[PDB]
Amino acid sequence: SHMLRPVETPTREIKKLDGLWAFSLDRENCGIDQRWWESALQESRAIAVPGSFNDQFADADIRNYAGNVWYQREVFIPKGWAGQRIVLRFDAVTHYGKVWVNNQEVMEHQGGYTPFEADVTPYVIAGKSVRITVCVNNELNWQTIPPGMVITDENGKKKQSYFHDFFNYAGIHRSVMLYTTPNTWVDDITVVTHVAQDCNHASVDWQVVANGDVSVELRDADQQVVATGQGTSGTLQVVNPHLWQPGEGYLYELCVTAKSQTECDIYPLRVGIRSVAVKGEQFLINHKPFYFTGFGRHEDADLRGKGFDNVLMVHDHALMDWIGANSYRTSHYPYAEEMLDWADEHGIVVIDETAAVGFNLSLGIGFGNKPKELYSEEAVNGETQQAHLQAIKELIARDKNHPSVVMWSIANEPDTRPQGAREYFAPLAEATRKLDPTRPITCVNVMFCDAHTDTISDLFDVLCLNRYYGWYVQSGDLETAEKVLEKELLAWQEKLHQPIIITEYGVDTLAGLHSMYTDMWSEEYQCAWLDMYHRVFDRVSAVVGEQVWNFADFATSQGILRVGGNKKGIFTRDRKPKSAAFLLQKRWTGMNFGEKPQQ
Amino acid sequence: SHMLRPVETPTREIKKLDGLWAFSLDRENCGIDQRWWESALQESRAIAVPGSFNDQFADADIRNYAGNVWYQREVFIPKGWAGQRIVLRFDAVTHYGKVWVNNQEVMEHQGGYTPFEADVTPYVIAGKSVRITVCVNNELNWQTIPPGMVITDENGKKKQSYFHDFFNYAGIHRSVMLYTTPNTWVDDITVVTHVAQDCNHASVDWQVVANGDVSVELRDADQQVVATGQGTSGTLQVVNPHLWQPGEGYLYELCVTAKSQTECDIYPLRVGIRSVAVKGEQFLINHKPFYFTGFGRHEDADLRGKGFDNVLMVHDHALMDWIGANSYRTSHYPYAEEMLDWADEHGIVVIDETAAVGFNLSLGIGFGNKPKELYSEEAVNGETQQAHLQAIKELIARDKNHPSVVMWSIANEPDTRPQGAREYFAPLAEATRKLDPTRPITCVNVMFCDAHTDTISDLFDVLCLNRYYGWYVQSGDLETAEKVLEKELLAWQEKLHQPIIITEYGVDTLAGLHSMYTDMWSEEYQCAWLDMYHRVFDRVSAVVGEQVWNFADFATSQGILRVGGNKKGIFTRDRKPKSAAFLLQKRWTGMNFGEKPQQ
Known part of the structure; x- marks a missing residue:
């Protein structure tokens, strides 16, 4: 389904609905029956949008709630929008949202981390106030991405069981907005940027969906027209192109005009001219080997949970730039698109991941009784696989034109020991390639699915290994850990002869715990390991x-493994550096940019 | 007064009285009037000896007590000691002790940090139990070393005011013992070790006090006699001597025999053959320039306060050795002699300091109303100067033969602005040189008594500067601090052309406080500064x-400047390293041993 990022244009306005909304739990689950959307929420309080609902209130009973919650506000339609196509858009509602405009059901979405929207032209009047109600549900089951099990106790109280190592935050995490197009509009754009070997010529394919005649102008960063074309599809030639390079990120602008006899629409799409390809064991950007440095991240901060926030995005990018990180992975869900606009502009390389973590009943992370077969009718089944395909489609439909995105990760750490694993993943691998043939794909690999055990990594282009020898096993023993690690990486090189990215390596590190014995949980062990x-x-x-696990300490489910959360951060949750930040700074700023270090 | 360290010999036994004693406060000050020493202490509890009394009980009212406390135990005189000279010895009682054996007053001492003892032969019977009572007083006045003022509130409650930046811990801090000699005994020994320029010959002068004919044998570390002599005084020649060198500490043994017609006594004194001298701006050990690295220390640990403890001494020496420290100063009081036995054996260079800190009414550290003239009848006066001379005599009488001790510090950070300062210090400088002409002297210099201000440093041999530019002033500004520091060190070089030791540089550092802004109290600022x-x-x-201030975080008087104590440690009080420990490790193990680093 077509999902262009809203941008203000001579033909397009946006009105953010971010701010304070009314908020209510629905512990009895009577809000759909009582049609709560038909009036003011009854027993409500103020909540910040965007933000997780969980931590805004310092209230355990809200933080740990499972079921539906209700958001509501009133908003004025701008008078001048009369005659315009008016769209209501949620950038992300975790995990499910249903939306009403007054008493009209307008939208529904499953998937906590990509946008949904409806044409609300027929249900509003320009110059009048409308009521927006959202029913938001945070429950995971075997057909949600990510999966989980709701345990209902003998008293009917719901508790979310889940298999991933981050807290199941929920709510309206990203911006809500009304926006306009003309009644003729550019609905969709795909670009493909081809790049000669010698890097001295490039071609830019375009494809546009719109209810009108289509012309394009490609403009350089000085706003000079370098190429023009006509029709819904074609190819622009670019002589001596300014390639999108890691560490710089030069962008062109592809202005798409849809003209009907009466009205017209202008959509500017930022375009980075770059090719990505795997050859042997090399990951090539613009025909040159690249070496990834940086982080697995999370969307996680004090008070706001997974809510988007510009100050956090500015501060964290300044920390990644300082430490010499050139890349990150959107562990373990699509991130706010503002992050990919940032990556495009500053030339940061991104592995774009889906929300399909947890496909694994043999880890100690997350959280009743787990089913015995992971791939069965009663767990990961045909409907799960459909839901996963939908999550991959929605991610690619959103991110297909970001030059910063160099690879798709379709899942993190599935259990690939059973026969079902290949049967489930093979068709997902194939459909991802059809959806976007311009980028390599991966499926991030769990440690116990070793080179001798794993059944699906041959179906993918890049080997993304998550490894923690010397932590969960060979605990505190660097000497044994080092032998086991080297042995396993060489066994993977022999087996598949793919490029290997270590997409996770890290140890829990309590800021301020220091040891002369360089032992687990100390700042010194983090550095030595x-x-x-x-x-x-x-x-x-x-x-x-x-990619170091993780950029910063982050919230998890409570348990015996997690000392107030996940402490594998390089930074604390309040963004203070541990000693290991200075270790990474020296290695990553001391190497040649994008080039494999040496002994 | 003669003070040889007790050692077990064919002619000398020791019985430690360390262990649990009875303990009592004397809030009404009626214990001398009621002669508490004549019976069991009445309302007593168990206390560990040795140890400060203050922190053993987790009790604020005991920790903050000012006045007399009472220690008592019973002990059996060994049956075989009949006919022996029996001595009762306290290695240190902070700050004053009076001792009774049953109902006989045997000893009294003022000075919290050196030994006192009495011949108790006439007051005990071999094979019977005696009662030892100690009245211990912790009050400072203008005639104590260090000085202070007791403020009595309107209700008669005593509170100790004092001018030094460490907590006024009190009690029996070091070992208590009975020991024997024969009725003929070696009472005193002075050695002087002279060393040819070429280092290929050395001479060892001796002087002995004893009530019998005296012979000496000098034995090398293999126990081979290299030299013999006769008489109370003389010189031993040593061909191709194994010099006592920093980082090695080769020791000989000078066995002193006192023979009467009937009985005899053997005392083995460890002797390190080494010369110390200042020439120009060089500190020479064995005619070679030395560069001091290491710490200002304190006697300070959890629970025991300033009490001596072997595990702490073993652990701390292993930390100083690891970090590459070659030296320390006994800031700000004589340390347990076991520390100087350790320094002798491992070749650690020591600046031996008296307890004369606090001679300064213009600092912000310590703690009623301060007197207006520091050097006056009503503050530091003639009797103070006598008490200071006595403290210097007692330190030298104890430590004169330790080869590890390379310099005497007679005080730390006196206010030398007034005319009285030189009048008070000049005679102290002269008397120190007469007491031990074999070692250079210093008086450690406070920052506000700068090269243009100070009135007494010309009377001393080495310039020991305590400096904290970028901390107490130019707060957090490394750029200004660096200019002011360099300017002042060069002004000192021009003024006196002496060797300069920085005997204090450090910043408060809260373990686990991390900052990207490298600002005060952070681990990062400690490193940058x-x-x-x-x-x-x-x-x-x-x-x-x-010498970095300080080896480890330590207790102080409560105030707005001290976050649970002094946080200028390289290590925490529980001996965990801050990031700056690794900075010092690299600089100090990366230089050539004992040699000034280079740019």
Whole structure:
């Protein structure tokens, strides 16, 4: 379904609905029966949008709630929007939303991390106030991405069981907006940027969906027309192109005009001219080997949970830039698109991941009784696979034109031991390639699905390994950990001869815990253990990247493994550096940009 | 007064009285009037000896007590000691002790940090139990070393005012013992070790006090006699001597025999053959320039306060050895002699300091109303100067033969602005040189008594500067601090052309406080600020040493400046390293041993 990012144009306005909304729990689940959308929410309080609902209130009973909650506000339609196509858009509602405009049901969406929207032209009047009600549900089951199990206790109280190592935050996490187009509009754009080997010529394919005649102008960063074309599809030639390069990110603008006899629409799409390809064990950007440095991240901060926030995005980018990180992965869900606009503009390389974490009943992370077969009718089944395909489609439909996105990760750490695993994943691998043939794909690999055990990594282009030898096993023993790690990376190189990215390596580190014994949980162990990984990576020719787990400490489900959360951060949740931040700064700013270090 | 360290010999036994004693406060000050020493203490509890009394009980009312407390135990005289000279010895009682054996007053001492003892032969019977009572007083006045003022509130409640930045811990801090000699005994020994320029010959002068004919045997570390002599005084010649060198500490043994017609006594004194001298701006050990690295320390630990403890001494020496420290200063009181036995054996260089800190009414550290003239009848006067001379005599009488001790510090950070300062200090400087002509002297210099202000440093041999530019002033500004520091060190070199030791440089550092802004109280600021000092030291030819303030976080008087104590430690009070420990480790293990670093 077509999903262009709203931008203000001579033909397009936006009105953000961010701010304070009315908020209510629905502990008895009577809000659909009582049609709560037909009036003021009754027993409501103010909530910030965007934000997780969980931590705004310092209230355990709200933080731990499972079921429906209700958001509502009133808003004026701008008088001048009369005659315009008016769209209501939610950038993300975690995990499910249903939306009413006054008493009209307008939208519904499952999937906590990509946009949904409806044409609301027929249900509003320009110059009058409308009531927007949202029913938001945070429950996971075996057909949600990510999956989970709701346990209902003997008293009917719902508790969410889930298999991933981050807290199941919910709510309206990203911006809500009304926006306009003319009644003729550019509904969809796909670009493909081809790049000669010598890098001295490039071609830009376009395809546009719109209810009108289509022309394009490609403009350079100085706003000079370098190429023009006509029709819903075609190819622009670009002589001596300014390539989109990691560390710079030069962008063109492809202005798409849809002209009917009467009205017209202008949509500017930022275009980075760059090719991505795997050749052997090399990841090539613009025909040159790239070496990934940086992080697995999370959308996680004090008070706001997974809510988007510009100050956090500015501060965190300044920390990644300082430490010498050139890349990150959207672990473990699509991130706010503002992050990919930032990556495009500053030339940051991104592995774009779906929300399909948790397809694994043999980890110690998350959280009743787990089913015995992971791939069965009573767990990951045909409907799950459909839901996963839909999550991949929605991510690609959103992110297909971001030059910063160099690879699709379709899941994180599935259990691939059973026969069902390949049967479930094979068709997903094939459909991802059909959806976007311009980028390599991955499925991030769990440690116990080792080179001798894993059944699906041959179906993918890049080997993204999540590894924690010396932590969960060979606990505190760097000497054994180093042997096991090197052995396994070389076994992977022999088996598949793919480029290897270590997409997770990290140890829990309590800020301010110091030890002369360099032992687990200390700042000193974090440093010695990352250093040992680095030494091994640099001796393996197939390793083309390293993304530290994690950028910052983040919230998890309560348990015996998590000391107020996940402490594998390089930074604290309040963004203060641990000693290991200075270790990474020296390695990553001391290497040549984008080039595999040396011994 | 003669003070040889008790050692077990064929002629000498020791019985430690360390262990649990009875303990009592005397809030009404009626214990001398009621002669508490004549029976069991009445309302007593168990206390560990040795240890400060203050923190053993988790009790604020005991920790903050000012006045007399009472210690008592019973002990059996060994049956075989009949006919022996029996001595009762306290290695240190802070700050004053009076001792009774049953109902006989045997000893009294003022001075919290050196030994006192009495011949108790006439007051005990071998094979019977005796009662030892100690009245211990912790009050400071203008005639104590260190000085203070007891403020009595309107209700007669005593509160100790004092001018030094460490907590006024009190009690029996070091070992208590009975020991024997024969009725003929070696009462005193002075050695002087002279060393040819070429280092290929050395001479060892001896002087002995004893009530019998005296012979000496000098034995090497293999126990081979290298020299013999006769008489109360003389010189032993040593061909190709194994010099006592920093980082090694080769020791000989000078066995002193006192023979009467009937009985005899053997005392083995460890002797390190080494010369110390200042020439120009060089501190020479064995005719070679030395560069001091290491710490200002304190006797300070959880629960035991300033009590001596072998595990702490073993652990701390292993931390100083690891970090590459070659030296320390006994800031700000004589340390347990076991520390100087350790320094002798491992070749650690020590600046031996008296308890004369606080001679300064213009600092913000310590703690009623301060007197207006520091050097006056109503503050530091003639009797103070006598008490200071006595403290210097007792330190030298104890430590004169330790080869590890390379310099005497007679005080820390006196206010030398007034005319009285030189009048008070000059005679102290002269008497120290007469007491031990074999070692240079210092008086450690406070920051506000700058090169243009100070009135007494010409009377001393080495310039020991305590400096904290970028902390108490130019707060957080490394750029200004660096200019002011370099300017002042060069002004000191021009003024006196002495060797300069920085005997204090440090910043408060809360373990686990991390900052991207490198600002005060952070681990990062500690690192950047020590680094800036190091860069400046290495550009000044007169700087022959650096002793970081302080080895470890330590207790102080409560106030607005002290966040649970002094946080200038390199280590936490529980001996965990801050990031700056690794900075010092690299600089100090990366330089050539004992040699000024280079830019």
